[PDB]
Design an enzyme around this catalytic site. Structure first.
Site, PDB file in Angstrom:
ATOM      1  CG  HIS A  68      36.896  34.985  42.594  1.00 26.95           C
ATOM      2  ND1 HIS A  68      36.391  35.161  43.847  1.00 26.95           N
ATOM      3  CD2 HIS A  68      38.033  35.707  42.515  1.00 26.95           C
ATOM      4  CE1 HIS A  68      37.188  35.969  44.522  1.00 26.95           C
ATOM      5  NE2 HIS A  68      38.187  36.338  43.721  1.00 26.95           N
ATOM      6  CG  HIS A  72      37.322  38.660  38.545  1.00 26.96           C
ATOM      7  ND1 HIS A  72      37.484  39.894  39.127  1.00 26.96           N
ATOM      8  CD2 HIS A  72      38.423  37.951  38.881  1.00 26.96           C
ATOM      9  CE1 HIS A  72      38.639  39.923  39.796  1.00 26.96           C
ATOM     10  NE2 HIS A  72      39.231  38.745  39.658  1.00 26.96           N
ATOM     11  CG  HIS A 106      43.543  36.974  37.524  1.00 26.29           C
ATOM     12  ND1 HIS A 106      42.549  37.460  36.746  1.00 26.29           N
ATOM     13  CD2 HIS A 106      43.205  37.245  38.803  1.00 26.29           C
ATOM     14  CE1 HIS A 106      41.606  37.970  37.518  1.00 26.29           C
ATOM     15  NE2 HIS A 106      41.986  37.860  38.794  1.00 26.29           N
ATOM     16  CG  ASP A 107      40.955  34.979  40.153  1.00 24.21           C
ATOM     17  OD1 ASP A 107      41.658  34.414  41.007  1.00 24.21           O
ATOM     18  OD2 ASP A 107      40.540  36.136  40.275  1.00 24.21           O
ATOM     19  CG  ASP A 217      42.623  40.468  41.470  1.00 27.11           C
ATOM     20  OD1 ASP A 217      41.592  40.188  40.796  1.00 27.11           O
ATOM     21  OD2 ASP A 217      43.085  39.759  42.370  1.00 27.11           O
ATOM     22  CD  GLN A 269      33.584  46.840  50.609  1.00 28.78           C
ATOM     23  OE1 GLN A 269      33.608  47.263  49.459  1.00 28.78           O
ATOM     24  NE2 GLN A 269      34.235  45.748  50.969  1.00 28.78           N
TER      25      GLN A 269
HETATM   26  C1  LIG Z   1      38.784  40.863  46.774  1.00 26.19           C
HETATM   27  O1  LIG Z   1      38.985  42.282  46.991  1.00 26.19           O
HETATM   28  C2  LIG Z   1      37.921  43.198  47.059  1.00 26.19           C
HETATM   29  C3  LIG Z   1      37.383  43.965  46.009  1.00 26.19           C
HETATM   30  C4  LIG Z   1      36.325  44.867  46.248  1.00 26.19           C
HETATM   31  C5  LIG Z   1      35.761  45.039  47.509  1.00 26.19           C
HETATM   32  C6  LIG Z   1      36.283  44.294  48.557  1.00 26.19           C
HETATM   33  N1  LIG Z   1      36.004  44.206  49.900  1.00 26.19           N
HETATM   34  C7  LIG Z   1      36.855  43.274  50.508  1.00 26.19           C
HETATM   35  C8  LIG Z   1      37.050  42.820  51.838  1.00 26.19           C
HETATM   36  O2  LIG Z   1      36.333  43.276  52.733  1.00 26.19           O
HETATM   37  N2  LIG Z   1      38.092  41.942  52.100  1.00 26.19           N
HETATM   38  C9  LIG Z   1      38.892  41.442  51.102  1.00 26.19           C
HETATM   39  N3  LIG Z   1      38.696  41.819  49.855  1.00 26.19           N
HETATM   40  C10 LIG Z   1      37.733  42.743  49.558  1.00 26.19           C
HETATM   41  C11 LIG Z   1      37.355  43.399  48.314  1.00 26.19           C
HETATM   42 MG   LIG Z   2      42.604  35.339  42.626  1.00 31.55          MG
HETATM   43 ZN   LIG Z   3      40.946  38.064  40.559  1.00 31.89          ZN
END
Ligand SMILES: COc1cccc2[nH]c3c(=O)[nH]cnc3c12
Ligand SMILES: [Mg+2]
Ligand SMILES: [Zn+2]
Length: 313
Positions: A68, A72, A106-107, A217, A269
């Site tokens: 983050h 990003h 945004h972050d 995002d 995933q």
């Molecule tokens: C933040 O979003 C993502 C972008 C790419 C891969 C990702 N895997 C997860 C997950 O297992 N839980 C929540 N978010 C994500 C995620």
């Molecule tokens: Mg965020």
């Molecule tokens: Zn973000």
């Protein structure tokens, strides 16, 4: 006014593609961002002295966290660039300005912890905003930086246009709270499918901009497999630190966030692609057909994760 930014030939061509990677050179990211605002917006949209001073304050206020971070921010702004460029006439002069700044911002000031960890920690920010905790903080940080002497890149807008752009930016940032995405996509699904989706309806536009924000995002899932795979290491680096910090609060973390259960990642995933990503870019593609490449790449990467589980890499 006569100063364009330009990129090397490979970047100039690659940057138009959804699956563009902004590369390992930090010092080139602001030029990539300015290139995108000029092409997306006009060389006229912003005063360059002000925009450059905004970008550098925004960079200074992203932290050195595994995922983050500043990279990003610029990656998420590039996805919004791609969407806007393949859907030219659908968005206002204002919306194009607003949405690229909202993506970059945004972050802002992310520490690499979910809203959920703030609440269990009892962080002061959780007392100040009960839902979309970090997202209300990110928008707050954006308005703070805009209010720095010499950083108001919206100076030349009318009083009313200014208020519209900060409302576009406030809604855009809030919509990166994934807890809000589920309801938002379901309502967009029903509206498209009953045929009542109306782009002239402001409340409908907001819902569609919100989906785009989620789409931008999550855009790590839409890259070529080698980029998706290596970004996932950064994403999981944050999840494992958070799970460690849950353990310090006397709370066993969900198995995803636990760095003893790395084996469970590939199935983690699958569920994420099946419950979040595919549905997201499916709906996005039905409302905005020229965003189909994001869906196609997301499907390709879902397939690559299946191969990881089937012990084929
Ligand atoms: C933040 O979003 C993502 C972008 C790419 C891969 C990702 N895997 C997860 C997950 O297992 N839980 C929540 N978010 C994500 C995620
Ligand atoms: Mg965020
Ligand atoms: Zn973000």
């Amino acid at each position: 006014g006569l100063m364009q930014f330009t990129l090397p030939v490979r970047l100039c061509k690659e940057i138009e593609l959804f699956h563009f990677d902004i590369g390992p050179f930090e010092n080139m990211w602001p030029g990539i961002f300015v290139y995108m605002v000029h092409r997306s917006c006009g060389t006229s949209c912003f005063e360059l002295e002000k925009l450059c001073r905004f970008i550098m304050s925004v960079k200074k206020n992203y932290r050195r966290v595994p995922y983050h971070n500043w990279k990003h921010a610029v990656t998420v702004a590039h996805c919004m660039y791609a969407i806007l460029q393949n859907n030219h006439t659908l968005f206002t002069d204002l919306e194009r300005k607003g949405l690229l700044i909202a993506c970059l911002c945004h972050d802002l000031d992310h520490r690499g912890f979910s809203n959920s960890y703030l609440q269990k920690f009892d962080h002061p920010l959780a007392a100040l905003y009960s839902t979309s905790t970090m997202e209300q903080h990110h928008f707050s940080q954006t308005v703070s930086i805009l209010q720095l002497e010499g950083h108001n890149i919206f100076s030349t807008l009318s009083s009313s246009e200014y208020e519209q752009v900060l409302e576009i930016i406030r809604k855009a940032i809030i919509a990166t709270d994934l807890a809000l995405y589920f309801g938002n996509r379901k309502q967009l699904e029903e509206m498209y499918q009953t045929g009542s989706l109306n782009l002239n309806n402001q409340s409908h536009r907001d819902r569609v901009i919100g989906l785009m924000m989620t789409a931008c995002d999550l855009c790590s899932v839409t890259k070529l497999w080698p980029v998706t795979k290596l970004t996932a290491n950064d994403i999981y680096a944050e999840f494992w630190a958070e799970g460690d910090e849950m353990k310090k609060l006397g709370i066993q973390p969900i198995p995803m966030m636990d760095r003893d259960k790395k084996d469970e990642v590939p199935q983690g995933q699958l569920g994420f692609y099946n419950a979040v990503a595919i549905p997201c870019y499916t709906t996005l593609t039905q409302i905005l057909p020229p965003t189909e490449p994001l869906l196609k790449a997301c499907r390709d990467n879902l397939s690559q994760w299946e191969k990881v589980i089937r012990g084929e890499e």
